[PDB]
């Protein structure tokens, strides 16, 4: 969803 907690934050993961 438009918010998932950063949309994006907890799957930074990739870069570490």
């Known amino acids: ?3 998932a907690x950063g949309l994006a ?3 930074x993961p ?3």
């Open 1 to 3: 969803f438009a918010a």
């Open 9 to 11: 934050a907890p799957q």
């Open 14 to 16: 990739a870069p570490f």
